[PDB]
Every structure is written in structure tokens, then in C-alpha cells.
Design an enzyme around this catalytic site. Structure first.
Site: not given
Ligand SMILES: [Zn+2]
Lengths: 51, 302
Positions: B64, B67, B122, B191, B265
Site C-alpha cells: 500500500h 504507508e 493506496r 503495513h 501494522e
């Protein structure tokens, strides 16, 4: 260029649940002459919904 | 190359070339395909040997594009690996047992776009027939309950799954390489943001057969990560720890025989969100590295 308008089939915005979805278009150099996308805003500023 | 700043695609690629040049016996930059717009997909392979069934771990980043902390952490990690080989016994024994493949920029077209046009982009940049909206979510495009609950049929959505699994050449390239090479034992997908360390499943509430082990391993890794500067992560299965997500990379990996499948994340928890300041790159990368090593030590030992 198409008028900006409220989204159709927006879905959730998990990271910012009460964000507002707008279908937003801008002239661009492609086959259509413009590119549109969903843009989400919170307090008038853009945000992303998924991580 | 200032590892404490964000960089262009070209600069990241050049630094990967520099790393393989610095350590030719250990690191080689490998092309595995190209993006929709014809940018190369580059991985670094870190390896001390070769075998028909030699195990390997895949480290995925930047699927993505917005990020930015993921690509930045990834390129720092490439340098950390070559810097620490034969100095730190942990990464040394890991590399003596298995190969590490690292993809710092899994979505190059989106990445360039975040620097030229739209910082919050994204998706891929592929065409959608009949639509003025561009791109599919490469993390909804994998063959893992494809188009199930946890994605969108709308090309204009952040989570558009695409017309069929593997439609996105960026994803097809990784799938093809992993299937042909074989013997992957780990797949870790970097991510941001939210500070979560998750494992399958995203497409269903069903419990992974290895859930107990994966949760244990994840909690150990989160503790190692917190040891640096106290950064706290939550742990659990994707669907109930963040949200439902279908056709995601780690679910595909796990359903295709890759046991140690995890999503990080990274920082932060919403103060800056995707716009994490450059001054947190090194702190993020250092703490994440302890987490990654913990997972890879467990791979080595099973
Ligand atoms: Zn993501």
C-alpha cells in the site's frame, strides 16, 4: 469533468468511522480526460480508511 | 543515502543495488516481474547457500503506497541484515539455515504516485474498464476467499478487489515467484498504521489450525519489539483485530503452505497516521527488527 458528488456504495471507513465520502474528479491526461476516486474527509481534511 | 529520510523509488532501487554491490556473496538484487506501468519489481535475496528444498522467508513491504514507513523500514532492514551478518549471532544462524527474500516496494506505481500526485494513494494504478476510477487494492487481490466479505466490487473504493484473483501484475509476480521457488516457511507483510501484529484469518472468523503457536510467537515478537523504546502492539487474528479483509497476502500464504504468516501494522496509533514523520523511521525500523528476528528465530527452530 463530472461534478463532485456523494459516494455510491462507499462502505465503511474503519480507521476514521465517521469520515465523509465524496466522489471527486479532476481533469487528467488519459482516455477519459479525467480521473475520479473516493475521497474521505474528517473535519474537512483528507484521511485514509484502511491500513 | 540518509536512512532517516523518505526517498524516491529511484533512490530506494539504487540503494538496493549498492547493498548487493557491498556484499556480493550474500545479497543480490533480483527482478521478479514488473508493475502495471512497467517499473521493475525488485527484491533483495539474502542467502548463504542453495538447495532444492532450502527454506526461505518472504518479507513484503509497501504493497500500500501511502504507508511510507513500510518502504522506509524495509530499506533500512536490508542494510541491517548485511551490516549484522557474521556479527550478530542471531541473524547469522538464521541466514545459515534459510534464505530471506525482501521486497521493499511491492507497489512501485502507487509509490511514485504518492510523491507526484496524491500522498494518500493506496492502490495499484491499473485501468478499470468502463470506469474513470483507477486501481485495485493489491491486498484484496490474492486467491484467498477472493471477493469474499472484506473487500469491494467498486473500482472507486480503496478496497476494490479487482476483476479476478491475481489480476494485478504486482501480485501475480510475487505469487508466481513463491509458487515456482517453493519451500517458503514464513511470509511477513509490513503495513501501517495501528501497531498490531496479526496472523490469519482476515477472510473468516474460523481459527487457524496453528493459531495457538502463531499467537504465542507474535506475543514474543511484540515483547522484543517493545524492549527498545516501549512501543506497544496488540496481537490477534486479522478479522477480529483490525477488520474483515478478503484476498489478503498472509491468508493466501498460509493457505498455500506458509506456516509463519504475519502482518505488522507499524507506527503510529493515529496521531500522524500514514504521515509518520521521517524522524521516527530509524526508531521504528530498529524496534521492528527485533520483532522480525524473533519470528525468524522461531522459523529457524521448527
Ligand atoms: Zn496496508
Amino acid at each position: 469533468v463530472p461534478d463532485d458528488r456523494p459516494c455510491i456504495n462507499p462502505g465503511r471507513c474503519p480507521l476514521v468511522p465517521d469520515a465523509t465520502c465524496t466522489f471527486v474528479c479532476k481533469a487528467a491526461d488519459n482516455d477519459f480526460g479525467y480521473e475520479c476516486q473516493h475521497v474521505w474527509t474528517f473535519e474537512g481534511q483528507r484521511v485514509g480508511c484502511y491500513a | 543515502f540518509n536512512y532517516g529520510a523518505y526517498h524516491s523509488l529511484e533512490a530506494i532501487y539504487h540503494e538496493m543495488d549498492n547493498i548487493a554491490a557491498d556484499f556480493p556473496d550474500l545479497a543480490r538484487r533480483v527482478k521478479i516481474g514488473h508493475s502495471f506501468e512497467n517499473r521493475p519489481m525488485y527484491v533483495l535475496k539474502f542467502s548463504t547457500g542453495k538447495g532444492v528444498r532450502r527454506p526461505a522467508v518472504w518479507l513484503n513491504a509497501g504493497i500500500h503506497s501511502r504507508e511510507w514507513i513500510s518502504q522506509a523500514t524495509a530499506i533500512w532492514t536490508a542494510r541491517k541484515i548485511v551490516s549484522d551478518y557474521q556479527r550478530d549471532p542471531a541473524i547469522t544462524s538464521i541466514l545459515e539455515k534459510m534464505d530471506i527474500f525482501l521486497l521493499p516496494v511491492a507497489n512501485p506505481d502507487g509509490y511514485v504516485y504518492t510523491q507526484t500526485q496524491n500522498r494518500l494513494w493506496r492502490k495499484t494504478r491499473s485501468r478499470n474498464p468502463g470506469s474513470s476510477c483507477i486501481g485495485a487494492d493489491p491486498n484484496r487481490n490474492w486467491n484467498a476467499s477472493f471477493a469474499g466479505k472484506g473487500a469491494s466490487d467498486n473500482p472507486c473504493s480503496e478496497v476494490y478487489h479487482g476483476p479476478h484473483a491475481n489480476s494485478e501484475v504486482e501480485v501475480k509476480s510475487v505469487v508466481d515467484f513463491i509458487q515456482k521457488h517453493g519451500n517458503f516457511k514464513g511470509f511477513i507483510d509490513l503495513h501501517s498504521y495501528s501497531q498490531l501484529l496479526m496472523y490469519p484469518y482476515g477472510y473468516s472468523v474460523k481459527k487457524a489450525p496453528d493459531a495457538e503457536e502463531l499467537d504465542k510467537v507474535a506475543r514474543l515478537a511484540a515483547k522484543a519489539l517493545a524492549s527498545v523504546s516501549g512501543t506497544e502492539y496488540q496481537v490477534g487474528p486479522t478479522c477480529t483485530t483490525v477488520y474483515p479483509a478478503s484476498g489478503s497476502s498472509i491468508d493466501w500464504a498460509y493457505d498455500n503452505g506458509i506456516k509463519f504468516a504475519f502482518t505488522f501494522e507499524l507506527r503510529d496509533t493515529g496521531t500522524y497516521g500514514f504521515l509518520l514523520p521521517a524522524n521516527q523511521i530509524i526508531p521504528t525500523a530498529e524496534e521492528t527488527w527485533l520483532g522480525l528476528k524473533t519470528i525468524m528465530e522461531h522459523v529457524r527452530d521448527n
